[PDB]
Amino acid sequence: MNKYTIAIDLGYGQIKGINQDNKRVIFPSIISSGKDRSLDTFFNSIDNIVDNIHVKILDEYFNEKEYFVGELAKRQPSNSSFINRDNKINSEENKVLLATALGLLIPNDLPNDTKIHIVTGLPLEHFIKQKQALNDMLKDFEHTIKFVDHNFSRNIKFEESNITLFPQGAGAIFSKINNDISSLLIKETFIGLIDVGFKTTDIVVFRINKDKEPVFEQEMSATLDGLGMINIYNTMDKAFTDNSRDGSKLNTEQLMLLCEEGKIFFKGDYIDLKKDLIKARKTLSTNIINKADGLWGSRKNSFNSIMIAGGGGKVLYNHLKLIEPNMCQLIDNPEFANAIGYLEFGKQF
Template sequence: MNIGLDLGYGYVKGVNDKGKKILFPSIVSIGFDRILSGIFNTNENIVDNMYVKIADDGGEKSYYIGELAKREGFSDSFMLDTEKYNQSEAKALLATATALLMTDEDKIINIVTGLPLKQYQTYRKQFEKEIKQYKAIVSFPEYNLTRIVKFDKVIIFPQAAGAVYHALMNNLDKYMIKDSYIVLIDVGFKTTDYVVFLINNRLRFSPDLSGTLDIGISKIFVALDKLYTQKTGSNTDTEGLLSILENNNIYFRGQYIDFTKELNILKNELARLIKKSILNSLKDKYEKVSTMFVAGGGGKDLYPYLKDAHANVELVKDAQFANAYGFLKICQMQQDIA
């Protein structure tokens, strides 16, 4: 089986070549046996209710992952450490996502995943080695499901560059304008990657024009946390902040508190910072850009505020999964070559 997996700071996005896709928050907490879970959670989707036991070289540990960690975890915060890729929590996300995308018949697992451009050159080999050597027994006790996770072929690819494969996949000829440039902006939770390609008979990656910005949707989270306290005199958790971001409001003491105005201001300012940085990087090459693509879960949220960055700005189809689908395409292409 081939898997494309985007281990984002905010969400894990995964797809396989059998058409299955998964999405859950990148939140990991220590887990405990839940005695009453069998009474109340029998009809819940496994992705929304992940109590997981993982046995690897470090022994067996229990975790709440994703939505369950957000609701009931000892820690409900996202993983924002720059070097998270060598941490046990990151491996727990990797193992859990892979187990969910596997079936009992899958004995060979090929995977492509990615790193932000800023980290790619430094951490690529280390991350690839760790995944190749990784083996775990992953079980979901409440669903009587166990998988053995190990990888046969591993490729680490730059984020955003993966999304380009997805953006161009179905209509490459439309964008093959000689001597022009294509830009893809991938807005994530902690970072924003932007990649630039020169069209010259084929796509040529332009590393000097591409980069990673240390800004993403988490900037809005920080501001929302302060605004919530100002409006209510109280504090909220990650689940509450996500609710505000998704719904523009939150229920508090018998009424809905509206954040629409504040969110519009915050999103517009974040988009302005992103546009300014990318335009400064492109300089005179901006005049030769034919298309700017916007991808990522954050890109989906910010697209209305990024549309004026260029005369031709397109939101990538299924933007939150753009890297995962691009990684899957790369995985399949490598298998065809082999």
């Protein structure tokens, strides 16, 4: 019958997802072992299901494992250490996280003849290179989910022609602004889109033609592998150990707490690292502009709009504005820029 549409993302930083109903979810890309949560059930009332995703996922052979995942995994000390998430696209780390949002974004009691289009993405250099790696993994995806503490299952199995493949940052401007920026696009310019990811920051440019339609440039656009917010967590982790002078290491949760604040609490004291947070944010923003103008000669003057996105783009927008003032603006949903771009351009099918 008619098939539903759910747009997800495989971001190493945090998983970003939305359905056809615009009901959207967001949670960090961290998994852990699952343990029986009934003692904490009586003390604090579990209201936020996204905060408390204890979950068990069957295979087709009745094998399933307990999992804490996300914020609940970030409270665990032995979770996925988040600096070492598996770069294999077919990892079980990928498997649980992929079924996680699909459990959360399928509403209750849809008809079984109504399937769901899933819309995903890859980093831009890694899209065609790893397309069939994901394509077989999407067809291999055949599970059944069970939520602990909320107790509603989903049957999850899809073949080819139920899936959708467009890169990270591609449909973010190829949809959702492409039918809206027509007042600004005139002829033979370039719109600028930079998705500031956690591991990898993506640089993507669209040339507009004579016919007021976007066309893609691949020599002026690239994936910055190893450039992203992961540099800041790695930098400030040295900054805490250099300021503590003891070898005291923050955990995984204090790491992500640090580069949102710059003021970690530590043993009756706030170890002040706000100055080093200023040091990282100006350094990374300078590094993005330099790699941008590596791809950009005098065609930077051929720009008319520069949009940025990502959670890093939410927190670097002032320093990343300095490519071009009055042209470096921010997109509406910096996290969900891929998500609705996957959604509306997934509505073509």
